[PDB]
Amino acid sequence: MPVKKQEAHRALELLEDYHARLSEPQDRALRIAIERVIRIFKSRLFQALLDIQEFYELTLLDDSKSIQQKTAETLQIATKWEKDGQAVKIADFI
Amino acid sequence: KQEAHRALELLEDYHARLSEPQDRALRIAIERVIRIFKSRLFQALLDIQEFYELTLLDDSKSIQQKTAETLQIATKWEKDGQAVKIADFI
Ligand SMILES: [Cl-]
Structure with a gap:
């Protein structure tokens, strides 16, 4: 039950709490x-997390790739x- | 078990094993x-935070304006x- 204001990690939590009071x-339209x-x-x-998962599988998880290659x-x-x-x-676009 | 919600935890684990x-360079x-x-x-959460501050917490704005x-x-x-x-662009 935080007293600190504008904590970024709680930003969505507070939006949720606001919705729950409407x-x-x-x-209702709001x-x-x-x-x-x-x-x-x-x-x-979700898409940002998938960016990591994509990087992790295509780069780090591939035994076929050299360390210099992975670092690059x-x-x-x-x-x-x-x-x-x-x-x-x-x-x-396109 | 590799749900995307754990994508960061996995990367941090892999780092902790090099x-x-x-x-070391990797x-x-x-x-x-x-x-x-x-x-x-963090910047994405600040997007919500700034919207919350500028729109939702401003009770001088009508409900109609907040909705819009x-x-x-x-x-x-x-x-x-x-x-x-x-x-x-740089
Ligand atoms: Cl190698």
């Missing part, structure tokens, strides 16, 4: 909108994730 | 990936989720 009929945010956010988290691939993927906020990313 | 001196590289991934997650802002941020995030990277 019981009045006039608050509640349904929040449900959608929550679903979309969870999908984002590992440095690359970190650099890519690092640049993501400055990346040009096109919605509904 | 003990040979010749593996180990440091993996530490970097773990740090960068945690940063990614909540719908629009999800729409933006949904697009960002299917967006494909074509480059980055």
